[model samples]
Target: STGYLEELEKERSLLLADLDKEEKEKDWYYAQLQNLTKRIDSLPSLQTDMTRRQLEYEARQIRVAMEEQLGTCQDMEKRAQRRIARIQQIEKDILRIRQLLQSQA
Candidate 1:
């Protein structure tokens, strides 16, 4: 009876250790999810600003290229329009990411 009780205690101890490990893992994943959500919220306008900057840079480059080609300023305007379209697509992507983050909540 003593050996049987000792074995039972040992089994219980192992089970408790396993439960503790699982709880820790659950906590870690929860923290990770929260951090990701926080990061998304903190950068709410980051995507828009980033896209704007990218379009501006591209416009500058297009201007330089058109100038070297002796092209009209209208060419730059056309390029800007195209860049704006691309930026709109980026905005869509940002919205999708935001939606996914919201779903996680």
Candidate 2:
């Protein structure tokens, strides 16, 4: 009976030691987070405006993409509208367009 009681006390002490270690770890991480917040606050913010040439270059790039996409979409509809095209025999032209439709990455 005494041996069993001593074993229970020993187990309790072991568990308490683990609990103490976890508390110490939690406090260390908490301090790390506070230190990170202070470091982040030290950086300054800067805002700048876009120039006229930058605007023109961006506009040209945007327009070129639009024209290319319009041409491809026209090709797809033109192919699909044929009253004499086949049915799933030698099918690859539209698949390339389909793969590029919404996935570019």
Candidate 3:
């Protein structure tokens, strides 16, 4: 009877050890599951921030192109005004020469 009781006590201790190990494994799995869910939850906001930054960069590029075009147009307008003034001067010179010739005749 004493030997049988000793055997039973040893078996009970072993079973308790097994149960403890299983509980530890379960806790580790639960922690891993929590980490993965957090990553999944954070993904959409990260993607949104990336998209917004890309749009801002594209808008900056377009604004720079428009400014360059406006500067080129202003330069062309200045050149045209200078040419118009010179044309007016040449017309006056021609008319004066014609009037002088008529008076001399």
The prediction achieving the highest lDDT against the true structure is 1
Candidates in order: C-alpha RMSD to true structure: 26.2, 29.4, 45.4
- How does candidate 3 fare on TM-score? 0.39
TM-score of each: 0.40, 0.38, 0.39
Candidate 1: tens digits of C-alpha lDDT, residues 1-105 = 135444544555555565566457546644655654554456546786786566556556655654565346566457545555655554565556666768999
Instruction: Estimate, for each residue in 9-104, the C-alpha lDDT of model 3 and write its tens digit.
Output: 455555556456645654664465565455445655677678656655665565456446434546645644655565555456555666676899
What lDDT does the true structure give each of the candidates?
Answer: 0.56, 0.47, 0.55
Q: List the residue pairs that clash in candidate 2.
A: none
Q: Look at candidate 2 and tell me the lDDT of residue 58.
A: 57
Candidate 2 lDDT over residue span 27-92, tens digit each: 664465555455445544132123434444655565456446434546535644441233222134
The whole-model C-alpha lDDT of candidate 2 against the native structure comes to 0.47
Query: lDDT score, residue 6, model 1?
Result: 47
- The residue pairs in collision within model 3 are none
Backbone clashes for every candidate come to: 0, 0, 0
Q: Which stretches of candidate 2 lie over 4 Å from their true place?
A: 45-105
